[PDB]
Amino acid sequence: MKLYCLSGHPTLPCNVLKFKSTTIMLDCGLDMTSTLNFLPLPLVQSPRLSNLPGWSLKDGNAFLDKELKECSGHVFVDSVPEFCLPETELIDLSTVDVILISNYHCMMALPYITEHTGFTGTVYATEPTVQIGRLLMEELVNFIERVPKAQSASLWKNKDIQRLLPSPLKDAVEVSTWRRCYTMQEVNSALSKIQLVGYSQKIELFGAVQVTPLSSGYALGSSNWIIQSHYEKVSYVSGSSLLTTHPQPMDQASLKNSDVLVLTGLTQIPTANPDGMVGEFCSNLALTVRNGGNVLVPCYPSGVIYDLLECLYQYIDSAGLSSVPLYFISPVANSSLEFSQIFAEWLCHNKQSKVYLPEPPFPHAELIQTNKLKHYPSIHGDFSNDFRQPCVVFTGHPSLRFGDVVHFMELWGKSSLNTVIFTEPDFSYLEALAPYQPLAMKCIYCPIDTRLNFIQVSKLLKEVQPLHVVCPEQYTQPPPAQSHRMDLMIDCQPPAMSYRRAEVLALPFKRRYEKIEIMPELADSLVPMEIKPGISLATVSAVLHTKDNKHLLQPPKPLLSGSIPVEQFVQTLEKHGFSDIKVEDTAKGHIVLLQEAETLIQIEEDSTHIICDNDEMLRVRLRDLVLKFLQKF
């Protein structure tokens, strides 16, 4: 069973597994870290972004001052932001049968694969995952659009120049395969190729395999996949979170008893304590608002935002800051809020009960009804009229490379009272903020993560006891941040064989048994017989019918095994009618002579030879006499 890893990212995997006569791809991860290398996409051109000085090739042969620009002694490319892709050329994706989705973050890259390659297979995902994915892709398309930055810097992409270019540009990967953002017609085609699935729905593929999504708990609708035939198990776990959260609690029960366990999407900041760091969030926000500045907060309009909003809802009354309003600005803010409200069956038990007691499960509905929190499509329009200060503004894109956050933060950077508070842990906020540096704005880094940490990983591995474990090489090797620490690298027995970007692996498994069904008529017809204690066997004879890779047997050459004792041979010959049979012994066998037809039989260990005259009736009589002194196989 061959496993292909087509994305070196430790959190946004793309894994093509092969099983029986089927090929299954898991996840379509869009490494949106690569976008960091490009300049921001302003909503309105600002002089400082416009007039940035040009980095120059030291040789000067190439005219790279136009492509590259430098700020704070650093270098950035200058074009429309870009995105890295999974390496699609390892295997023709067109031969891929089924695609599975883990979570809205892991399905971000879906259109590229679903449309361009000619993929004709089906796609599976949970209802909230597909909806919120259609929301995020809409947001991304809108952000990249709305200010088409036509420029296309391509000379820098060359490998030879890339070698000379300074860091981090030296650090780019597969710079060649980068592709511009997709469009809405592709998005619609992708989302229309999808088909839905609920939790624990046992989807059978051609009878060839059986796939099941199980509650993960990371976010609202994230699913850990389980692929099984009747005698195997491959558990693909991507982004679970056993902490106490709003999504449906993680179910480890079915995970145990797994042949192969693919593990992905561990935490990003292992040392981060979610609860204490949310406390730091609230304290810092309160202090800044009391100082009277303005607070900016980048965050995807989903996921962690809702937990953050519950915490803020409970904490605001603690300091009595009712005066300061919360603005939530994004082209999908309203839709995301309503979709979070409707999905009750997927939330935690507490919230499902809050629904059974008629009331909207989340409290941000109560916030909106109270008018403390106001959601707006984008800064242009009504928000401009209804602005206030001081305030707390939830922007759209935490990549800091585009959206409404870039404009707000070019607006507020000059001041020092104002503060930007990072929460989404997916991007190195240092590189994120590099282009805007210098900045008087106080920068606070409190990155909230909820994915399982290494200790819980060890617990789960011991609880499930897998036959094999497969994880990214980043986990196996200790993080570069703390080479000293040992808890920061995964541990298992046998050791988790690792992998890297664009790698091919062969699982240490062999196909031995598979499932086939007998039919009752033949079952009744068959008569078991025993040779050993507790072992009853019977020779079989039938015709197989195969449908949809499912096999069945119905009624329409076995051989011999076992020595024939000469004493019983002669006894049964005499009691059946034979006479004048004389037996002599040899070193290891017996020679028995029957006078009729002059039949001589030599019986040795695992050897019996009969020699008679040209006879047919007596020959067949001897055949049926001797064959019935053993067990037929």
Partner: protein, 496 residues
């Protein structure tokens, strides 16, 4: 040069999963040869192909297929690939890549016989796999390799093979065979009769296409096209929703069918109850899960209604009733189909219902579509014209923004059948017999609306300027001066 350097680098690296993968990715990612050196590169790649870990070989075959698009390679690559396939039988993936490369070569340029499409086809046929290795891909290979206008036997057996995926592959190959003609035999009809009931998705989805395409060729079974249409009908209620789209579209495209059997689709009614008061496939297809199938149904109905001059009268009620569908797309499609079948059709009592819709909130598209429908409909009863006139006046007085279309629809409604309006002339414009009526305002866009009808009707009937009152003559001159694309020239004495 570059190819030789790449081959040397790959040989030097000799790293099992690292060097080969990196070299293949770089070579494919960077660029094509764009020269005759493609043959040398292919020879070098085949030289290293003798190795282990068939993943590298598969990647090399993919690179070869990509390079084959350059059109530079011809018979050398074909011979090399045939030789490699003759002995490279290892697992399914390697044969898969080899078959893909062979297909690329075959359809890339040669498109010819003489071991350009025949030898490869024979080799693929002889290389039939045991377990899903190439089966589908070799089927589509022979599908794109059309032997001649004389092959169907092999696919005949393969239809009832193991895997539904292979069944779909055979079906698509059959489609490719048909699209080049090939005069498919009749027995495929009877063979696909069972394919209809395959009890798996993605199979029937194209089995329906096959039954349609074979049926439309020639209607001779015992009734053949009628039988196939009956099969499609019995299928229209398929469990899925994806099938029904093809089901509807294909029966719509079909055009010739037995009349008597055609109405049996629509036969079940409150509609006939209303008709008396004044005096099954589509029946279910029209009301289905999601609007896609409704759109397909209305399109099929409009197509075959156009085809058959009869059967239209039976479908007017089924169209008109389905106006308040709540899906604007279905709204618009219903209006469009009614327009497209509006000919030799009567609305003895349907007038009021189809006109009630004219009052929509704004629905500018819907109301404009209704005007378009009216300008091309037909009515037979004078009271019908009167009724349409009064509802149009209400429309104009409530939505004073589309008068510019109200006038044109009235113009056509007059020109289409003039004599119907002649009895209305005394009544519609006040002409109190022995009182001189006060000049109605010249520019009022209700008086202009009712005048344009009369003037357009007046081209035909010579007697009616007698009915025309005092003002109407100078008013006609003013209209004919203002709106020259609504009122034609007439015989009036004032403007000779």
């Amino acid at each position: 040069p570059s190819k030789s350097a790449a081959l040397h680098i790959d040989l030097c690296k000799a790293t099992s999963p690292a060097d080969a993968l990196q070299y293949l990715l770089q070579f494919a990612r960077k660029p094509v040869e764009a020269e005759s050196v493609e043959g040398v590169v292919r020879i070098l790649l085949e030289h290293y192909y003798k190795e282990n870990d068939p993943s590298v070989r598969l990647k090399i075959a993919s690179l070869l297929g990509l390079l084959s698009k350059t059109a530079g390679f011809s018979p050398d690559c074909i011979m090399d690939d045939a030789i490699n396939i003759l002995q490279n039988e290892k697992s399914h993936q390697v044969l898969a890549q080899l078959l893909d490369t062979l297909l690329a070569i075959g359809t890339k340029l040669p498109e010819n016989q003489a071991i350009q499409m025949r030898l490869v086809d024979v080799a693929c046929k002889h290389l039939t796999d045991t377990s899903h290795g190439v089966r589908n891909k070799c089927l589509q290979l022979l599908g794109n390799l059309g032997s001649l206008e004389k092959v169907q036997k092999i696919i005949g057996d393969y239809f009832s093979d193991q895997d539904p995926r292979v069944r779909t592959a055979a079906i698509k190959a059959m489609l490719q065979l048909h699209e080049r003609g090939l005069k498919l035999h009749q027995t495929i009809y009877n063979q696909a009769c069972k394919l209809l009931s395959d009890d798996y998705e993605q199979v029937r989805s194209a089995a329906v296409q096959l039954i349609w395409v074979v049926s439309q060729l020639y209607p001779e079974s015992i009734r053949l096209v009628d039988d196939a249409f009956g099969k499609i009908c019995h299928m229209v209620s398929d469990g899925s929703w994806v099938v029904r789209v093809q089901a509807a579209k294909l029966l719509g495209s079909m055009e010739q069918v037995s009349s008597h059997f055609l109405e049996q689709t629509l036969d079940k009614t409150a509609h006939e109850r209303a008709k008396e008061l004044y005096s099954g496939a589509f029946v279910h297809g029209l009301e289905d899960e999601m609007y896609e199938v409704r759109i397909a149904a209305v399109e099929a109905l409009c197509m075959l209604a156009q085809s058959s001059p009869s059967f239209a009268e039976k479908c007017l009620d089924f169209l008109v009733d389905m106006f308040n569908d709540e899906i604007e797309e279905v709204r618009l499609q219903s209006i469009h189909t009614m327009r497209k079948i509006s000919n030799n059709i009567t609305l003895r009592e349907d007038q009021l219902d189809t006109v009630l819709a004219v009052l929509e909130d704004s629905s500018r598209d819907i109301r404009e579509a209704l005007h378009e429908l009216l300008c091309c409909t037909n009515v037979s009863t004078k009271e019908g014209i009167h009724l349409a006139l009064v509802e149009l006046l209400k429309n104009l007085t409530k939505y004073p923004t589309d008068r510019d279309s109200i006038w044109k629809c009235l113009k056509f409604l007059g020109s289409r059948h003039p004599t119907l309006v002649l009895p209305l002339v005394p009544e519609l414009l006040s002409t109190h017999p022995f009182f001189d009526t006060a000049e109605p305002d010249m520019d009022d866009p209700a008086y202009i609306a009712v005048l344009v009808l009369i003037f357009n009707a007046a081209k035909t009937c010579p007697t009616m300027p007698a009915l025309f009152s005092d003002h109407t003559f100078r008013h006609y001159a003013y209209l004919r001066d203002s709106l020259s694309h609504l009122v034609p020239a007439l015989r009036l004495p004032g403007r000779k």
